[PDB]
């Protein structure tokens, strides 16, 4: 903000009617302090707290020490008493740019005394002068007319602790709205025809995204089948619909003759294309044996699945080992 309100006049500005991307906003990364006591937008990038407000105010450097929960004293008592249990973080950085000095702009005063400390959530914007214990005063140079608003160290300052910090508290005191406005907008690229874990607007699922010809309605976002299982998802970043299917999901059967006769065996992968069989078992096992059965010259495809280690033959014989779909395997040459 070009102009920052004083601590005594901190504004409870709220943010809504849009979706934000904290990652882009964090390009500067000039914040001096990071005190987070919850699911912060920086710490957590998959939530959209609704009742989130960015308090636009400026405080002196030392006051940064008193921006903790349940804090009391000076700023925490009279100027800005944050909620005792506030969900959010406190951000403070030393700029001293708008003030035109390294000491502190005089306009950034801070209320004090008044014998009335703030509540954890209330504000007492008022220009009234502190009342004396013998005769009321409201200005001039009467009896104990001390101005509650005291200017910062406009004179030269040595330590940063006595300088104006553009401190904004990202406290979100959600009451009835779980999440409507997003601070962080973490996102990745798009992958198709590959088994991956996808998170679309909080819907998490493992599958192979593929281009879909379904024509979802403009308001419609997700899709489902008669079984009440997701089978199509719309890209939130573009008017595109992608299907969802299990990655491979097969079973392994060992077509083996009697060990008293031979030891070589065949492997059947249920209802999976042979092209995916090498990746089906990851081919990460011990180099011989399994790898030989992972793929090879003798690979056959059938309604049952992919058979490796058996040589397809035109000749038809009696069913020796039942594989399925009217197809059987035998050890005979």
């Amino acid at each position, epitope marked *: 903000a070009t102009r920052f309100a004083s601590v005594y006049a901190w504004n409870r500005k709220r943010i809504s009617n849009c979706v934000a991307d904290y990652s882009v906003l964090y390009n500067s990364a000039s914040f001096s302090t990071f005190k987070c006591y919850g699911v912060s937008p920086t710490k957590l990038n998959d939530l959209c707290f609704t009742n989130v407000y960015a308090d636009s105010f400026v405080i002196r450097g030392d006051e940064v020490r008193q921006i903790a929960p349940g804090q009391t004293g000076k700023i925490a008592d009279y100027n800005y008493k944050l909620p005792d249990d506030f969900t959010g973080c406190v951000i403070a950085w030393n700029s001293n740019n708008l003030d035109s000095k390294v000491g502190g702009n005089y306009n950034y005063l801070y209320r004090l005394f008044r014998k009335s400390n703030l509540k954890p959530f209330e504000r007492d914007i008022s220009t009234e002068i502190y009342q004396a*214990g013998s005769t009321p005063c409201n200005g*001039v*140079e009467g*009896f104990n*007319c001390y*101005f509650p608003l005291q200017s910062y160290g406009f004179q030269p300052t040595n330590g940063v602790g006595y300088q104006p910090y553009r401190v904004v508290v990202l406290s979100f005191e959600l009451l009835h709205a779980p999440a409507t406005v997003c601070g962080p907008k973490k996102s990745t690229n798009l992958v198709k025809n590959k088994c991956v874990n996808f998170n679309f607007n909080g819907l998490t699922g493992t599958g192979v995204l593929t281009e879909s010809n379904k024509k979802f309605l403009p308001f419609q976002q997700f899709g489902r089948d008669i079984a009440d299982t997701t089978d199509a998802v719309r890209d939130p970043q573009t008017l595109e619909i992608l299907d969802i299917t299990p990655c491979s999901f097969g079973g392994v059967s060992v077509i083996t003759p009697g060990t008293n006769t031979s030891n070589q065996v065949a492997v059947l992968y249920q209802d999976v294309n042979c092209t995916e069989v090498p990746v089906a078992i990851h081919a990460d096992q011990l180099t011989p044996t399994w790898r030989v059965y992972s793929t090879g010259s003798n690979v056959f495809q059938t309604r049952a699945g992919c058979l490796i280690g058996a040589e397809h033959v035109n000749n038809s014989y009696e069913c020796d080992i039942p594989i399925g779909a009217g197809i059987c395997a035998s050890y005979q040459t």
Partner: nanobody, 127 residues
């Protein structure tokens, strides 16, 4: 640490005049008010005089009724020091004088609220 040093006082004939100096260091004396108190044998500590810097145009001075119209108090922020001028002194004025300052702005008559107190100096008035 905040240090307050009092100088002046001594023995003076009744009806004379005196000047007490209080030098304060270790804090911002310009804005926080400074109060002069006197403690006499058998008497507690009560407000005697005070000076405050409202910050707008002038320094306000408060004087106790029993010494009103005779005691003057002034503050020099550049020198961070306080003058207390007394005229037409009386025998009852014999006492130990302290000068006190506060870490913040407080009521002038609130002696206890003054978190800083100096050693002080003895003043005696003889007929």
């Amino acid at each position: 640490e905040v240090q307050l040093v009092e100088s002046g006082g001594g023995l003076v004939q009744t009806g004379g005049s005196l000047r007490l100096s209080c030098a304060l260091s270790g804090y911002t004396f310009s804005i926080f008010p400074t109060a002069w108190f006197r403690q006499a044998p058998g008497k507690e500590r009560e407000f005697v005089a005070g000076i405050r810097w409202n910050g707008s145009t002038r320094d306000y001075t408060e004087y106790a009724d029993f010494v009103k119209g005779r005691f003057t108090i002034s503050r020099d922020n550049a020198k961070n020091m306080v003058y207390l001028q007394m005229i037409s002194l009386k025998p009852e004025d014999t006492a130990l004088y302290y000068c006190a300052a506060s870490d913040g702005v407080i009521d002038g008559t609130n002696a206890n609220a003054y978190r800083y107190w100096g050693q002080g100096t003895q003043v005696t008035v003889s007929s």
